């Protein structure tokens, strides 16, 4: 199956999002329009400290008019190795380097209108040189993370997926 | 929370369509600097984790043009302002799957892509099912296979599978 694009019109090309409207072919000589937000993709990192705490960051997210606590993440460059990006992002956002960085899972965030894909990696064996402004570093135990979910301090799909992942590692 | 709040000082509408709106806010950073924020506005959604008497999760396959592929998802519908989300979830379950249910309980809410969109998903869990782009019922192991195969490939459905995984671990 497919909805072939017969014509595209570019609406907006920004620093984060690009928006286009596709005219598409539907069955029985039917036509429609599809609104499509294009986004480069992101890599996010599940990093566990020596104290067995999860590394997260708090920052304001304007679309939500709220600050939330998230696993560290950053944009993925076109044709850039996601693992390389995950290592830089972790270091840049939290100061940690790691000995191990392994892909876990990829998924679309809002497939109804966006092509954005998140690649989650798991980082192990952390170290930090104790050498921004609007990002708070936060380290949480598993039980604290679940409390943050109850309070909706944790409140986005990639971080919920990370917490449930860690819950799973525990139940086994 | 409100950490590092970024106040809007000016807004420009870019596009208003059937699925998404797009606007660009000029914002005031905490330090008095200014910057731009691209914001996709999207109504909320209710999604349903429906487990049958047979321990199978009810899902729906559908083409997602942004992804150029069909993926397997939990049922979900758009949120109706001035309507109990719990009613909206019951309606979506029946319309999309023909299943009726005795209990509809809120599990969790989260933003899908808080870096550029305000879309929030509210997941409800349906129990006591009875049969009152097609339907598909999956065991837990079949759902985990579909994740491996990237047929299950969006944040809300990954979270649902993880939740089944924890429930079955908890049924031990």
**In chain B, where the domains are located:** 7-41, 45-170
CB B153 within 8 A of CB B61: no
Nearest Cα neighbor of A71 from A8, A161, A151 is: A161
Q: Going by C-beta distance under 8 Å and a sequence separation of 6 or more, which residues neighbour residue A32?
A: A3, A23, A24, A26
Closest-CA residue to B99 (of B136, B69, B65): B136
Between CA A105 and CA A100 the distance in angstroms is 16
Considering only CA atoms, which of A157, A97, A156 is closest in space to residue A123?
Answer: A97
Residue among B49, B45, B115, B23 at smallest CA distance from A60: B115
Token output for A118: 């998140």
CA angle B106, A117, B88 (to 5 degrees): 25
CB pair distance less than 8 Å for B110 and A160: yes
DSSP A172: -
Distance CA B92, CA B102 (A): 14
Dihedral sign for Cα atoms in the order A151, A154, A156, A162: negative
Find the distance separating the first CA and the last CA of chain A, reported in whole Å.
Answer: 39
Spatial contact of A42 and A75, defined as CB atoms under 8 Å apart: yes
CATH architecture label of A42-170? Alpha-Beta Complex (3.90)
Of A14, A15, A161, the CB nearest to B159: A161
**Burial grade of A62 (CB within 10 A; 0-12, 13-18, 19 or more):** buried
Spell out where chain B has E strands.
7-16, 21-28, 34-41, 45-50, 57-64, 69-73, 76-78, 99-111, 120-131, 135-138
Torsion of Cα atoms, B27 then B29 then B32 then B38, to 10°: -30
Q: Kindly determine whether residue B40 and residue A113, on different chains, have CB atoms separated by under 8 Å.
A: yes
User: How far off is chain A from B97, nearest CA to CA, in Å?
Assistant: 19
Could you tell me the resolution of this structure in angstroms? 2.0
SS3 B119: coil
* Cα separation, B28 vs B8, whole angstroms: 6
Q: How far does the CA of residue A48 sit from the closest CA of chain B (Å)?
A: 20
The two tokens of residue B109 are 């809410």
CA atoms B39, B153, B161, B136: torsion sign:
positive
Using CA coordinates, name the residue in chain A closest to B165: A168
Q: State phi, psi for A160 to the nearest 5 degrees.
A: -60, -45
Interchain proximity A108–B4, CB inside 8 Å: no
Q: Using CB atoms within 10 Å of the CB of residue B119, give its burial: 0 to 12 exposed, 13 to 18 middle, 19+ buried.
A: buried
- Range B45-170 classified under CATH 3.40.190.10: no
Other C-beta atoms within 10 Å of A63: how many?
21
The alpha-carbon radius of gyration of chain A (Å, integer) is: 19
Q: Give the closest residue to A140 by CA, choosing from A54, A70, A45, A52.
A: A54
Q: Which residues of chain B have a CB within 8 Å of the CB of A113?
A: 19-20, 40, 42, 66
The pair of structure tokens assigned to B135 is: 């339907």
**CB neighbours of B56 closer than 8 A, spacing ≥ 6?**
B137, B138, B139
List C-alpha distances in Å: A54 to A99, B14, B155. 16, 39, 20
Distance between first and last Cα of chain B: 37
Q: Are strands A54-61 and A136-140 parallel, antiparallel or unpaired?
A: antiparallel
Q: Which of A15, A19, A113 has the CB atom closest to B42's CB atom? A: A113
- Give Cβ neighbours of residue A60 (< 8 Å, ≥ 6 apart): A66, A67, A134, B2, B3, B4, B5, B6
**Of the candidates B169, B68, B26, B162, the residue with the CA atom closest to the CA atom of residue A104:** B162
How many CB atoms sit inside 10 A of residue A163's CB?
Answer: 22
Please give the sequence-ordered ranges of beta strands (E in DSSP) within chain A, or none if there are none. 5-13, 18-26, 30-38, 42-47, 54-61, 66-70, 73-75, 96-108, 117-128, 136-140
Q: Is A73 annotated as a binding residue?
A: yes
Cβ–Cβ under 8 Å, residues B73 and B46 = no
- Experimental technique of record: X-ray
Contact B38, A14 (CB under 8 A): yes
The answer for residues whose C-beta is within 8 angstroms of residue B133's C-beta and 6 or more apart is B60, B61, B62, B63
Beta bridge partners of B99: B131
- How far is residue B172's CA from residue B169's CA, in Å, rounded to a whole number? 6
- The nearest CA of chain A is from the CA of B63 a distance in Å of 7
Q: What is the C-alpha separation between B89 and B125, in angstroms, rounded? A: 9
């Amino acid at each position: 199956f497919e909805e072939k694009t017969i014509k595209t019109e570019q609406i907006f090309s920004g620093r984060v999002v690009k928006l286009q409207v596709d005219d598409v072919e539907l069955p029985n000589g039917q036509t429609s329009k599809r609104e499509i937000v294009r986004h480069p993709g992101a890599v996010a990192v599940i990093a566990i400290t020596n104290e067995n705490k999860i590394v997260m960051v708090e920052q304001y997210r304007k679309p939500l008019e709220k600050s939330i606590v998230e696993i560290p993440a950053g944009k993925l460059e076109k044709g850039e190795d996601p693992r390389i990006t995950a290592l830089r992002e972790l270091e840049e956002e939290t100061g940690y380097e790691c000995e191990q960085m392994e892909w876990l899972i990829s998924f679309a965030t809002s497939p109804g209108f966006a092509d954005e894909i998140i690649h989650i990696y798991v980082a192990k064996g952390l170290s930090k040189k104790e050498n921004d402004e609007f990002v708070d570093l936060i380290e949480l135990t598993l039980d604290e993370a679940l409390q943050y979910i109850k309070e909706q301090r944790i409140y986005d799909s990639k971080t919920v997926i990370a917490v449930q992942y860690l819950q799973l590692q525990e139940a086994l």
